[PDB]
Enzyme design. Structure first.
Site, PDB file in Angstrom:
ATOM      1  N   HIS A   1       1.107  -1.365  -0.317  1.00  0.00           N
ATOM      2  CA  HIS A   1       0.234  -0.345  -0.050  1.00  0.00           C
ATOM      3  C   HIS A   1       0.567   1.442   0.203  1.00  0.00           C
ATOM      4  O   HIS A   1       0.742   2.214   0.333  1.00  0.00           O
ATOM      5  CB  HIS A   1      -1.030  -0.405   1.103  1.00  0.00           C
ATOM      6  CG  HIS A   1      -0.176   0.099   2.498  1.00  0.00           C
ATOM      7  ND1 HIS A   1      -0.168  -0.506   3.185  1.00  0.00           N
ATOM      8  CD2 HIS A   1      -0.320   1.384   3.269  1.00  0.00           C
ATOM      9  CE1 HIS A   1      -0.063  -0.219   4.294  1.00  0.00           C
ATOM     10  NE2 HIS A   1       0.346   1.303   4.306  1.00  0.00           N
TER      11      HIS A   1
ATOM     12  N   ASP B   1      -0.811  -7.466   1.513  1.00  0.00           N
ATOM     13  CA  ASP B   1       0.452  -6.411   1.422  1.00  0.00           C
ATOM     14  C   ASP B   1       2.184  -6.206   1.787  1.00  0.00           C
ATOM     15  O   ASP B   1       2.530  -6.123   2.296  1.00  0.00           O
ATOM     16  CB  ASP B   1       0.005  -5.639   2.464  1.00  0.00           C
ATOM     17  CG  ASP B   1       0.306  -4.741   3.245  1.00  0.00           C
ATOM     18  OD1 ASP B   1       0.559  -4.200   1.533  1.00  0.00           O
ATOM     19  OD2 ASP B   1      -0.059  -3.463   3.792  1.00  0.00           O
TER      20      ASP B   1
ATOM     21  N   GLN C   1       0.288   5.557  11.644  1.00  0.00           N
ATOM     22  CA  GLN C   1       0.761   6.124  10.876  1.00  0.00           C
ATOM     23  C   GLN C   1       1.942   6.937  10.067  1.00  0.00           C
ATOM     24  O   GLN C   1       2.084   6.845  10.823  1.00  0.00           O
ATOM     25  CB  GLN C   1      -0.624   7.704  10.328  1.00  0.00           C
ATOM     26  CG  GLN C   1      -0.562   8.678  11.154  1.00  0.00           C
ATOM     27  CD  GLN C   1      -1.188   9.823  11.159  1.00  0.00           C
ATOM     28  OE1 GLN C   1      -1.563  10.286   9.820  1.00  0.00           O
ATOM     29  NE2 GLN C   1      -0.663  10.913  12.275  1.00  0.00           N
ATOM     30  N   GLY C   2       2.212   6.088   9.162  1.00  0.00           N
ATOM     31  CA  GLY C   2       3.951   6.220   9.225  1.00  0.00           C
ATOM     32  C   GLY C   2       4.412   5.446   9.039  1.00  0.00           C
ATOM     33  O   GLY C   2       5.630   5.487   8.970  1.00  0.00           O
ATOM     34  N   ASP C   3       4.718   4.095  10.278  1.00  0.00           N
ATOM     35  CA  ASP C   3       5.011   3.431  10.053  1.00  0.00           C
ATOM     36  C   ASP C   3       4.972   2.134   9.314  1.00  0.00           C
ATOM     37  O   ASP C   3       5.491   0.912   9.609  1.00  0.00           O
ATOM     38  CB  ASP C   3       4.472   2.596  11.564  1.00  0.00           C
ATOM     39  CG  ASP C   3       5.296   3.409  12.514  1.00  0.00           C
ATOM     40  OD1 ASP C   3       6.302   3.889  12.548  1.00  0.00           O
ATOM     41  OD2 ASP C   3       4.425   2.991  14.032  1.00  0.00           O
ATOM     42  N   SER C   4       3.867   2.355   8.218  1.00  0.00           N
ATOM     43  CA  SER C   4       3.543   1.141   7.490  1.00  0.00           C
ATOM     44  C   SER C   4       4.861   0.895   6.789  1.00  0.00           C
ATOM     45  O   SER C   4       5.193   1.572   6.104  1.00  0.00           O
ATOM     46  CB  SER C   4       2.398   1.814   6.375  1.00  0.00           C
ATOM     47  OG  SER C   4       1.513   2.204   7.074  1.00  0.00           O
TER      48      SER C   4
END
Ligand SMILES: [Ca+2]
Length: 223
Positions: A37, A82, A169-172
């Site tokens: 993603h 993913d 959010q942003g750790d993905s």
């Protein structure tokens, strides 16, 4: 990372920061493993930058390299699968991170790391944070997410009871790892999604690397 602490310079040298705001791990010195993603699709792409070798993103010691190609998991559609590989224009001369090829380590306490928000809707971090989160079984995770969980392709972790510690959010795309029987770090997950961050009853969901190991190793060979 919510409920995190600062990782030391040199602790997790395989970590990279991607320009679109995702973490990644050095699968090979010039191949970053991250989440599907985080990218728009596969093909040649020289628009991504990988920042490696530092915990401090503002460090003059940062190594910044541009991508050349992206391979998103074939058939990714937002449900499962993913994972993606990013080929770099030059190698980042740092230790790589081995991935799990079996399910032997898909249990226990994992470590996650990232420059993501340390709170819901919080901002991105300058310094890499780390936290330990325990494995949550597919059944216990399903009790929370229902049909949204793809049990075979996803592994959950966190504290179902209290929340408090999680990726955000942003750790993905960042790796979820632990030590193997040889006391070497091994990658069991990719930060993928979750409802909010660190809320009781909603553990973080990660790509279950063991399921895709062969697929990843093969794609990596053609890059
Ligand atoms: Ca699972």
């Amino acid at each position: 990372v919510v409920g995190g602490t600062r990782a030391a310079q040199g602790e997790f040298p395989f970590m990279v920061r991607l320009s679109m705001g995702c973490g990644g791990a050095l699968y090979a010195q010039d191949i970053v493993l991250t989440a599907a993603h985080c990218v728009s699709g596969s093909g040649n792409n020289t628009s991504i930058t990988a920042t490696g070798g530092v915990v401090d993103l503002q460090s003059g010691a940062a190594v910044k390299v541009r991508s050349t190609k992206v391979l998103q998991a074939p058939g990714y559609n937002g449900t499962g699968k993913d994972w993606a590989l990013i080929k770099l224009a030059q190698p980042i001369n740092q230790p790589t991170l081995k991935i799990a090829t079996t399910t032997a380590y898909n249990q226990g306490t994992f470590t996650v790391a990232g420059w993501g928000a340390n709170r819901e809707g919080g901002s991105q971090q300058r310094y890499l944070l780390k936290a330990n989160v325990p494995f949550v079984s597919d059944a216990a995770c399903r009790s929370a997410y229902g049909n949204e969980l793809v049990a075979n392709e996803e592994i959950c972790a966190g504290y179902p009871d209290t929340g408090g510690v999680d990726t955000c959010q942003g750790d993905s795309g960042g790796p979820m790892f632990r030590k193997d029987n040889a006391d070497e770090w091994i990658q069991v997950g990719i930060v993928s999604w979750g409802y909010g961050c660190a809320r009781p009853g909603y553990p973080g969901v990660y790509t279950e690397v063991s399921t895709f190991a062969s697929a990843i190793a093969s794609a990596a060979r053609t890059l």
